Structure 1
């Protein structure tokens, strides 16, 4: 894709902190950029549509390569069009703004380069307000093994780059992306039946994904997802697997992950409105990526979680599922959880924590997003899922929401002023971001 010129692009600023020891942090002057898929795709010369609703123009985009040459990703009016604002260390993502639904943003090191985090033997903390996230919405904060430059050095027909939010990948090998690896996704494009703005193409973009935070006011989950190749790679067709393919398990990434949602793990009183972590008020989320030998070059061995609210430091609750022990993600926990829930162990098939850790070693990009779910209504996060199962069977119940909740047309109509706000990001050695 070309770099658009119809609407100017300016990246909202966002500060964050690097800590060297508890109480000893310094400020980084970051910025964020909107993902390419949200942008108008304009023909470079006449400023007309290359993509309208969910179909491509056949003159500008007769094939994938020609389309990338003829078409540009426009700049973004962050607040007015996308409902994205920032102030200091805080980033607020609104749900519905006009016809736009949510957003996906990446943290930048500079105007052409995503910030790379090396998570092994490190800790990441942030504050969040999920109080205005009802059933069916997901405010996600997570890491993916994207290329720092958004693909530009590998793919000459990507002239837009990280400056315009190119290069996304995740463990679903997403096929909804309009541009992957310097090519449009027009050959094989199939418009969505249920989303006026989207479709699925032949190309998908795979990479490992560390889902630090997927949450609303009802439930949250923390979930690593390994891939056979840790970093960004193209897939084609149904061999992509993931949520956009016929068989989610047909590809090279684990679409399910090894998840810890305290409600799903048998403690319904821990997280939610008025609960031990009270989602009606902001709180801090700390996540630690421990290695087997406690050094930077060890193998990822354990992912730990603490919350802080009203200055009280509260560890993740223990699993209360028979057969599944502890409050952290480890190989033993993941093996046991899949067995207890009767879920396929795709996590192990794609290399588990060893492959997750290999991705971490390559470096990962911070993503902040707000979305609703045109495949499964977020029921996997906050309801009983699958919806035909007995909700008393271990693994089925994930939150309080009814199984008819989360339909996009319902939540977009009923909760347009919902939002998520992320703030006070801190990153450093273990124990450096909070009072351990």
Structure 2
């Protein structure tokens, strides 16, 4: 895709901090950029839609390649069209703005380059306010193995790049992306938004997926860490027919404290009381305590009112601990009767390989047209006994979360992420 000219692209500023030790942090002047898929795509020569509603305009987009040469991703009015505002070290995502629903943003090193995080033997921490996120919404902060330049050096027809939020991929191998690898997704485009023949896969570390009711932390490995194209139902993921047909783990190894049997830990009025802000800390430990080692454990702490509170232990029979490890992941898949696609695609060793490639920080607010976010905050397989281990993930009713409901009833929902800090283990807090 080309770079557009109707609207100029100005990235909202966002500061964060890199630390070397507790109390010793340096502020970085970052910025964020809106993902390519939320943008208006217009023809390079005038101001005409290449994409109209849920369909490609064949005059400009008769095939994948031509479309990409003829069409441009426009700049974004962040506040007014997409409901994104930044202040200093804080970023606010509004749910519904006019006819826009939600957003996905990446953190930039500079105006053409995603910030790369190498997470092994490091810790990542951020403050969050999810008090205005009801059932059916997902305020996500996570990492994917995208190219720093958004694909430009690999794909000559991508002239927009990171500056326009190109190059997305995650463990679902999404086929709803209008542009992949410097080509439009037009041949095979089946309207619902819509899905095409091509998808974009890469390893995904979901540090935080949450609303005011439930949260989960979930690594999702892929055979190839790092961005790959797939095609048809071989993609697997949410949009393909068979979830488990592809090269990535679509479920992942998850720790949601509610699902693990502690229902008094996280929620309104609870130990982590989601009516107020709190701090989320995630450590990525290696077997030998060094930066070159194998990923072996993911640990979680929360901080609310200067109190440091560790992730609760699993209270599921035969599943032990409060951290993600190979042992935990094996035991939890068995005790819930879920297919162990995690270990099939290389588990934590392969999550670690992706972390070694470097990963991009994504911040997001979305609702779920496929599954109503019930996998996160309700009884998920809905046709199943909510007393059997692993079905119940939160207190939301099973009729919650349908997009046309939440978009109409809670349009002023929002999420705020702030005070991002990154460094060696135990440097981001006391």
TM-score between both structures, scaled by the size of structure 2: 1.00
SS of equivalent residue, structure 2 residue 81: helix
Task: After superposition, give the CA deviation of every residue in 1:79-105 in whole Å (9 maximum; x if it has no partner).
Answer: 000000001000000000000000000
Following TM superposition, by how much is the alpha carbon of 1:170 offset from its aligned partner in structure 2, in angstroms? 0.1
Following TM superposition, by how much is the alpha carbon of 1:156 offset from its aligned partner in structure 2, in angstroms? 0.4
Q: Report how many residues are paired.
A: 430
Following TM superposition, by how much is the alpha carbon of 1:261 offset from its aligned partner in structure 2, in angstroms? 0.1
Query: Which sections of structure 1, spanning at least 5 residues, go unmatched?
Result: 192-196
Q: 1:85, 1:239 → 2: CA distance?
A: 38
Following TM superposition, by how much is the alpha carbon of 1:329 offset from its aligned partner in structure 2, in angstroms? 0.1
Following TM superposition, by how much is the alpha carbon of 1:46 offset from its aligned partner in structure 2, in angstroms? 1.2
Q: 2:276, 2:317 → 1: CA distance?
A: 32
What's the counterpart of residue 398 of structure 1?
393
Q: 2:314, 2:54 → 1: CA distance?
A: 43
SS of equivalent residue, structure 2 residue 80: helix
What's the counterpart of residue 137 of structure 2?
137
Aligned ranges 1:29-40 → 2 under 5 Å: 29-40=29-40
Task: After superposition, give the CA deviation of every residue in 1:366-425 in whole Å (9 maximum; x if it has no partner).
Answer: 000000001000000000010011101000000000000000000000000000000000
What's the counterpart of residue 93 of structure 2?
93
Q: 1:351, 1:286 → 2: CA distance?
A: 25
> Which one of the candidate residues 267, 276, 282 is aligned to 2:271?
276
- The root-mean-square deviation of aligned C-alpha atoms, in Å, is 0.5
Following TM superposition, by how much is the alpha carbon of 1:255 offset from its aligned partner in structure 2, in angstroms? 0.1
What's the counterpart of residue 126 of structure 2?
126
Runs of 4+ in 1 over 3 A off after TM superposition: none
SS of equivalent residue, structure 2 residue 406: helix
Following TM superposition, by how much is the alpha carbon of 1:190 offset from its aligned partner in structure 2, in angstroms? 0.7
Q: 2:18, 2:62 → 1: CA distance?
A: 47
Q: 2:421, 2:338 → 1: CA distance?
A: 34
Following TM superposition, by how much is the alpha carbon of 1:252 offset from its aligned partner in structure 2, in angstroms? 0.1
Q: 1:433, 1:204 → 2: CA distance?
A: 36
Query: Which sections of structure 2, spanning at least 5 residues, go unmatched?
Result: none
Following TM superposition, by how much is the alpha carbon of 1:215 offset from its aligned partner in structure 2, in angstroms? 0.2
SS of equivalent residue, structure 1 residue 81: coil
Q: 1:330, 1:286 → 2: CA distance?
A: 17
Aligned ranges 1:188-337 → 2 under 5 Å: 188-191=188-191, 198-337=193-332
Q: 1:367, 1:136 → 2: CA distance?
A: 20
Following TM superposition, by how much is the alpha carbon of 1:131 offset from its aligned partner in structure 2, in angstroms? 0.2
Q: 2:429, 2:218 → 1: CA distance?
A: 22
SS of equivalent residue, structure 1 residue 79: coil
Q: 2:332, 2:5 → 1: CA distance?
A: 50
> Which one of the candidate residues 389, 402, 408 is aligned to 2:403?
408
Following TM superposition, by how much is the alpha carbon of 1:323 offset from its aligned partner in structure 2, in angstroms? 1.1
Task: After superposition, give the CA deviation of every residue in 1:114-168 in whole Å (9 maximum; x if it has no partner).
Answer: 0000000000000000000000000000000000000000000000000000000
SS of equivalent residue, structure 2 residue 92: strand
Task: After superposition, give the CA deviation of every residue in 1:222-281 in whole Å (9 maximum; x if it has no partner).
Answer: 000000000000001100000010011000000000000000000000000000000000
TM-score between both structures, scaled by the size of structure 1: 0.98
Q: 2:410, 2:339 → 1: CA distance?
A: 35
Q: 2:18, 2:237 → 1: CA distance?
A: 34
Task: After superposition, give the CA deviation of every residue in 1:288-319 in whole Å (9 maximum; x if it has no partner).
Answer: 00000010011000000000000000000000
Following TM superposition, by how much is the alpha carbon of 1:27 offset from its aligned partner in structure 2, in angstroms? 0.1
Q: 2:30, 2:241 → 1: CA distance?
A: 39
SS of equivalent residue, structure 2 residue 333: helix
SS of equivalent residue, structure 2 residue 69: helix
SS of equivalent residue, structure 1 residue 298: coil
Q: 2:303, 2:118 → 1: CA distance?
A: 24
SS of equivalent residue, structure 1 residue 327: coil
Task: After superposition, give the CA deviation of every residue in 1:312-339 in whole Å (9 maximum; x if it has no partner).
Answer: 0000000000011000000000000000
SS of equivalent residue, structure 2 residue 404: helix
Q: 1:133, 1:10 → 2: CA distance?
A: 28
Q: 2:49, 2:288 → 1: CA distance?
A: 54
